[PDB]
Amino acid sequence: TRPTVRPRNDVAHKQLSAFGEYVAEILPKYVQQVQVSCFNELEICIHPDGVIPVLTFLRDHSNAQFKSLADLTAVDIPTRQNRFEIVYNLLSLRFNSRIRVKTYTDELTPIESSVPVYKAANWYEREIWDMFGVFFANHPDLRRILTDYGFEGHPFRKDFPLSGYVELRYDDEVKRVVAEPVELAQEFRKFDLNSPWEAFPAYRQPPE
Amino acid sequence: EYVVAKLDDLINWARRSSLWPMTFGLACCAVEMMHMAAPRYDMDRFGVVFRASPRQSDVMIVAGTLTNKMAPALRKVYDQMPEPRYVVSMGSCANGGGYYHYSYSVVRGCDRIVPVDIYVPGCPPTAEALLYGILQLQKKIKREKRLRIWYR
Amino acid sequence: TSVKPIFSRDMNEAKRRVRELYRAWYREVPNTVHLFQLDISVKQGRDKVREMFKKNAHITDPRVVDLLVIKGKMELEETIKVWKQRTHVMRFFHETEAPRPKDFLSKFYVGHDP
Amino acid sequence: LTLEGIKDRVLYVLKLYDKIDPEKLSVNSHFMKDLGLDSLDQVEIIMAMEDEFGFEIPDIDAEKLMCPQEIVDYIADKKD
Amino acid sequence: KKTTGLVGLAVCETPHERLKILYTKILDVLGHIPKNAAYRKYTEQITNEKLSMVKAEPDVKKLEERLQGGQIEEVILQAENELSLARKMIQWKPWEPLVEEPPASQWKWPI
Amino acid sequence: NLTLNFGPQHPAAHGVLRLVMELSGEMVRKCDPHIGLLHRGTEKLIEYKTYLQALPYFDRLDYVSMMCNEQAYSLAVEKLLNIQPPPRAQWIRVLFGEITRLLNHIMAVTTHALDIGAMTPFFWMFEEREKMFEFYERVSGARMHAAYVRPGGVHQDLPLGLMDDIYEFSKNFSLRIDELEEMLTNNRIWRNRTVDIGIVTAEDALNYGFSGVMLRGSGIQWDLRKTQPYDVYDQVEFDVPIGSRGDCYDRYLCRVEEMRQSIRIISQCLNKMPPGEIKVDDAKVSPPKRAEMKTSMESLIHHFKLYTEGYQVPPGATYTAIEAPKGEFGVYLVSDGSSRPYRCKIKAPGFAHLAGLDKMSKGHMLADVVAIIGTQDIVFGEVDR
Amino acid sequence: IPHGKGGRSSVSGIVATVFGATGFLGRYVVNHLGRMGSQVIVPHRCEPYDTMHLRPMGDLGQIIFMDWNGRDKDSIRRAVEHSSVVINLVGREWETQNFDFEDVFVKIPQAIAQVSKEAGVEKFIHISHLNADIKSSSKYLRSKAVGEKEVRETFPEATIIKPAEIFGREDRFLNYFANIRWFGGVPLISLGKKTVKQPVYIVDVTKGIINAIKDPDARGKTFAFVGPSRYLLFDLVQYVFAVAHRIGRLFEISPFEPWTTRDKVERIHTTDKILPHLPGLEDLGVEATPLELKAIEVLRRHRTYR
Numbered sequence A: 001t002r003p004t005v006r007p008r009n010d011v012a013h014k015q016l017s018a019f020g021e022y023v024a025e026i027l028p029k030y031v032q033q034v035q036v037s038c039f040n041e042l043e044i045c046i047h048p049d050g051v052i053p054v055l056t057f058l059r060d061h062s063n064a065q066f067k068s069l070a071d072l073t074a075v076d077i078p079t080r081q082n083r084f085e086i087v088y089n090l091l092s093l094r095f096n097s098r099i100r101v102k103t104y105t106d107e108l109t110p111i112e113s114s115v116p117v118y119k120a121a122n123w124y125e126r127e128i129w130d131m132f133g134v135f136f137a138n139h140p141d142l143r144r145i146l147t148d149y150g151f152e153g154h155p156f157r158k159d160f161p162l163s164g165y166v167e168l169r170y171d172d173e174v175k176r177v178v179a180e181p182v183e184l185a186q187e188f189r190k191f192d193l194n195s196p197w198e199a200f201p202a203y204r205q206p207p208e
Numbered sequence B: 001e002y003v004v005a006k007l008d009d010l011i012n013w014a015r016r017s018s019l020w021p022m023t024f025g026l027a028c029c030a031v032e033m034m035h036m037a038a039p040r041y042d043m044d045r046f047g048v049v050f051r052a053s054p055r056q057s058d059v060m061i062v063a064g065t066l067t068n069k070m071a072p073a074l075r076k077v078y079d080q081m082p083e084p085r086y087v088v089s090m091g092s093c094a095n096g097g098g099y100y101h102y103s104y105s106v107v108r109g110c111d112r113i114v115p116v117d118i119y120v121p122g123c124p125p126t127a128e129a130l131l132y133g134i135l136q137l138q139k140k141i142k143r144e145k146r147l148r149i150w151y152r
Numbered sequence C: 001t002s003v004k005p006i007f008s009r010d011m012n013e014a015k016r017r018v019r020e021l022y023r024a025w026y027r028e029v030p031n032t033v034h035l036f037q038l039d040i041s042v043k044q045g046r047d048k049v050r051e052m053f054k055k056n057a058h059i060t061d062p063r064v065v066d067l068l069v070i071k072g073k074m075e076l077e078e079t080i081k082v083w084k085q086r087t088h089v090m091r092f093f094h095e096t097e098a099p100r101p102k103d104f105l106s107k108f109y110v111g112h113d114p
Numbered sequence D: 001l002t003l004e005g006i007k008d009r010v011l012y013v014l015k016l017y018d019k020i021d022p023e024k025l026s027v028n029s030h031f032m033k034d035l036g037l038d039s040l041d042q043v044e045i046i047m048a049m050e051d052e053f054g055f056e057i058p059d060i061d062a063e064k065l066m067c068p069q070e071i072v073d074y075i076a077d078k079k080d
Numbered sequence E: 001k002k003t004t005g006l007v008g009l010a011v012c013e014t015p016h017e018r019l020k021i022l023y024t025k026i027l028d029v030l031g032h033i034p035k036n037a038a039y040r041k042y043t044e045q046i047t048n049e050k051l052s053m054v055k056a057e058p059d060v061k062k063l064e065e066r067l068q069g070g071q072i073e074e075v076i077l078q079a080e081n082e083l084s085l086a087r088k089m090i091q092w093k094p095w096e097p098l099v100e101e102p103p104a105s106q107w108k109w110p111i
Numbered sequence F: 001n002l003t004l005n006f007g008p009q010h011p012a013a014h015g016v017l018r019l020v021m022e023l024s025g026e027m028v029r030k031c032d033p034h035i036g037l038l039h040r041g042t043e044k045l046i047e048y049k050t051y052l053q054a055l056p057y058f059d060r061l062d063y064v065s066m067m068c069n070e071q072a073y074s075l076a077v078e079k080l081l082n083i084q085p086p087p088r089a090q091w092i093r094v095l096f097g098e099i100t101r102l103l104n105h106i107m108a109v110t111t112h113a114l115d116i117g118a119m120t121p122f123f124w125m126f127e128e129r130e131k132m133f134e135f136y137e138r139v140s141g142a143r144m145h146a147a148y149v150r151p152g153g154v155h156q157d158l159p160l161g162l163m164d165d166i167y168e169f170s171k172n173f174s175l176r177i178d179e180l181e182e183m184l185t186n187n188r189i190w191r192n193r194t195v196d197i198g199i200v201t202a203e204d205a206l207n208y209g210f211s212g213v214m215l216r217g218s219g220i221q222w223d224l225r226k227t228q229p230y231d232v233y234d235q236v237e238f239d240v241p242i243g244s245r246g247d248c249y250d251r252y253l254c255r256v257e258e259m260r261q262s263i264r265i266i267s268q269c270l271n272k273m274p275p276g277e278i279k280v281d282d283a284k285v286s287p288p289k290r291a292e293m294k295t296s297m298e299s300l301i302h303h304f305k306l307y308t309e310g311y312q313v314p315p316g317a318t319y320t321a322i323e324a325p326k327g328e329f330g331v332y333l334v335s336d337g338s339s340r341p342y343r344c345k346i347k348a349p350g351f352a353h354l355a356g357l358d359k360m361s362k363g364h365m366l367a368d369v370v371a372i373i374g375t376q377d378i379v380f381g382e383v384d385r
Numbered sequence G: 001i002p003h004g005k006g007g008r009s010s011v012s013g014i015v016a017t018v019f020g021a022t023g024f025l026g027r028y029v030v031n032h033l034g035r036m037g038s039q040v041i042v043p044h045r046c047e048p049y050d051t052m053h054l055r056p057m058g059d060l061g062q063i064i065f066m067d068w069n070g071r072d073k074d075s076i077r078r079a080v081e082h083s084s085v086v087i088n089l090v091g092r093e094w095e096t097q098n099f100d101f102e103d104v105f106v107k108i109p110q111a112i113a114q115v116s117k118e119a120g121v122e123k124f125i126h127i128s129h130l131n132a133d134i135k136s137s138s139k140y141l142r143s144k145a146v147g148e149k150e151v152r153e154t155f156p157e158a159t160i161i162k163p164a165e166i167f168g169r170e171d172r173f174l175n176y177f178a179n180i181r182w183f184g185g186v187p188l189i190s191l192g193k194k195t196v197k198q199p200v201y202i203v204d205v206t207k208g209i210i211n212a213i214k215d216p217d218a219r220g221k222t223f224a225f226v227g228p229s230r231y232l233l234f235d236l237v238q239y240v241f242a243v244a245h246r247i248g249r250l251f252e253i254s255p256f257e258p259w260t261t262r263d264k265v266e267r268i269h270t271t272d273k274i275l276p277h278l279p280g281l282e283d284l285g286v287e288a289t290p291l292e293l294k295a296i297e298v299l300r301r302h303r304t305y306r
């Protein structure tokens, strides 16, 4: 249209529309939704029964190398009736292509972990346990990383408030550094920022 | 007495002439102190030597941001110091914990644990106001040891 | 429930597991009290152990108790070794905290109904 | 080797505990159907044989004894 | 050459027939799978595409072209794992249809 | 076996990273370190801020990078907003984006050479480093931590100067890198201090998910610097170093040649900059100028509202990564559709680069282990991802 | 008036003033007063550095430091002009080389029985001792009971507190024992007749003040501090060497902070289990502490494990 607008391309939008299509064709057992992003990204929605073999299928091939496990993350979504959302991100070395794996779950239902499939998930997989409580299956060493020793909260979900309950202080009553209920000097004034009038036409909801 | 009070103009001068500091590198306020060690604003030989073992310290410096996993380890090193000690904390995250201040796991203040004497403000204090804080500290030593047991 | 469990199946692989590590705590309470160099009586520690197990006895559903098993076992990893430097073990006892009133006439003179 | 030898050792375990049992050192204190305890406190009864006379308690038999006869009986086949 | 570029492997040893066994090693195991999934339809397609250009021509350097892997010893590893891939295709069953459809509104993004 | 925790010791380096050592007499064979000394509550904290207001908390994520961080954020936001940045602005993001690599690759050698215990190459190079912070103060706002890159391109134009200064600076730097060549390369003892240490070269050197150096310098040729573009970054000419074997001394010799590339690129970038503007013109993202927000009516309503709330970002997930001077830099920025973003999960190096210390360490001494760590160039506060 | 929880950063209404407060007793009392939160006004005598370890108890703005001598008047008046209550605990052992040491328990409690009382304070509380009697023993033990009556003329209702001997961490009486590494460990004086007094525990001391500080109605009705169960024995001296297994002084050393072979040695061996008709501790409840549990803490010698 003009300068100062991102020039999109169609070549990568073509092959990523082409490549991911016959992925669901050759495993119609686990794949439940595939979508192409408008900027050359791919999602393969997978029910977590096939958490191991689909990775194991992308672990090796002759048309898809994909042996660079970059990113394990975790996203919570309340009001979904199955809250959490484990999302991978893996890289083909020989092909320069990004693709993500979106696998939902719930809290108490475990997930067969990727421990034999990848050995870069040694510290990433434990993190979701410490922050959410998503108990992955058959991990050789589940422990506590990046949190303090006495928490019971799994803080990165939404019901855990901004401060905890555990504002710490010292006294010379004997020697100890003792815990106490939390007390702030200031509210953290919470604003109200959502302007009305719906700046977006394309993502318009079903109007019910 | 003119005879006895003349003596503490040597001893309370001698302690403000040789300070052997510890530094706790934790966050981005550690890096700027290294440039004070770099010989532009050469920190050595203006009264004060470089790094030193944890035993032989007088002036401890907390720099950066404290977490609850470090609140026990701070007090234990603070016990092992000898008696005429002083605590001086640089960095705006050692005075109220900067921002990160409303977070669930950051020590609010670095004052509810140790008693600190001189507060330098700022995300990084630019190794320009920090020598000014140290000359403030030697200016703070105008105290006396005589006319304390000579009074009471 | 269309969901697979963690370890137990129904209440009988469960309730034998909560009894199981109780002995591991029970020989641990005299073991650590001379180790972490703190000074209370050792029977207070055995009272606080059974304090924790008995309070959560209002569960009639598996894999939640089993979820507490993983929580209960992970406590012993720092405990048998030395990963709680003389504070976290003292954190179990609300010692220097002022007492909550918990009485209606006592609440009424102090507080806007907390 | 005396089968009376493990009879004395078992029958001052229970009253050495200062809890529930009011000098009922009888062989028929049938443990929460006669004697009356907590579900956890049964496991603490089994505990004092590792140090007194020495004993392992390897298996689910601690969930099986339920009477101080069978405690002697499970040490009976253990010993003689 | 004595170093294979990519450090961690060794030129071990002979091209043109170490490969030629391992393609044909897969094709015999490939026939074992029941043919309803298109996994056979593409995997047997590319191996016959590969082995036709593999067998049997000089040199090692010419075989690098028209066979888009790394060096030729690493092209072993391109199909080494693929032999370990296809034998586990008998163990689980991807040719079976879909299982556990999500409850009808989950993959909608704006809450 | 003795279970010493040589870590919390404030023995120079960086008094942190407290770990265990189940050493088998003299060899280690088991190392299980602990992290979490600074967790800081970062990823939870951003969930209440807006886009422009949350921006310096990316800056304080390293200790060193000031323009390579926030390079991984605006480029992670401008894709969502359908904007290419204006062409004068792209020549500055490559200039300061190829000047922070002349801060890591000075600090990544000297601080490694201080744990080892050499004194004089620590003072011989930071005294030359002072000639470079005068740039940061002259252009943006402060000593180090500069909220300078915005989502609307560059904040403001660099003033008169800074072109006969950088050319003055960069024409006298290769003599200083020829100093440390005499200090460490031709020396034998430091070579004897690091040869065949940390030989990790197999496909588990990539199955551990490592980013660059402690990659390609050990073998596998790949980088994000000429297979994936950023800005005007492919229109310059350079090469990428590869070492011979898979040890630390053949990932050390990447960094000498790496600094010999950033001098070429700066001396190539200065010849090609056109005059132009700074910000994006459509002003739903960039603020208007100060001489404009005092005259017209249209300027204030697209000024006063643009600071109460932020932008209007469309929904849909996104992801990117760029070359941090020690690795990749993953940002999986979940957008919701308002002025305040949703989840913002970051991947920093050190998750891979220090979990693989278990493989790398064993079979070796205890004095080896401190010499291992200063080769990966691990900075804490950055392992807070 | 109070507000919210008194965990920290509250108001709680009260505004106290604690003199002395540099020794073992006066420090540990205030460490409760900055927990519930109030305007604690502590003036110190001549010591800027010796209050450094005190500050991290009051949160922020709650404590304040001033200078005063005591023989001056307005320095004891300018500070106390805005408060509600005031306690005092000032005093020490042996006579100074410059002071007078008699009127310090007479005119110095009178110096704050000055316009201080007239200014509008209430619930003024002084300290006593259980053994301070008008009898001819001792030079320090008596002349404390002189202040108990001659200054009792002023402040007609006070509830002056009367403690027994105290044991805590860094006192003098219990640390007089086991600091006797010597060529002979002799008791006082090779006899098990009168030993011992009533060692009340230090948490009970600081708990008695905070209950009485808004009790109400505790003025004039003076109180006594019960000790442990029950009198005590000679076994205490043997109890030391059994389980132990046998601050602004100067720049080098103080020339005279001695063991004082004078009337120091008799001020403790004069037990005087006094009148039980004082209410005085259990009614100001609740204080119940044994000795056998708190003895591990304060004693510290070379074994440290077994």
Ligand SMILES: NC(=O)c1ccc[n+]([C@@H]2O[C@H](COP(=O)([O-])OP(=O)(O)OC[C@H]3O[C@@H](n4cnc5c(N)ncnc54)[C@H](OP(=O)(O)O)[C@@H]3O)[C@@H](O)[C@H]2O)c1
Residues within 6 Å of the ligand: B152, G020, G021, G022, G023, G024, G025, G026, G027, G044, G045, G046, G047, G069, G070, G089, G090, G091, G092, G093, G104, G127, G163, G164, G165, G166
């Ligand atoms: N309850 C008991 O068992 C017991 C036992 C022995 C003594 N006492 C007496 O009860 C109180 C307990 O004191 P403590 O155990 O904490 O030891 P302490 O060191 O005597 O504390 C009392 C404070 O009074 C200060 N002081 C002494 N003379 C002073 C003067 N002329 N002017 C101003 N301040 C003076 C002292 O030093 P500064 O001048 O530096 O402030 C000290 O800080 C004292 O009065 C003590 O004589 C009680």
Ligand code: SF4
Residues within 6 Å of the ligand: B027, B028, B029, B030, B063, B064, B065, B091, B092, B093, B094, B098, B122, B123, B124, F060
């Ligand atoms: S905010 Fe200040 S104290 Fe915190 S990391 Fe940055 S410079 Fe250091």
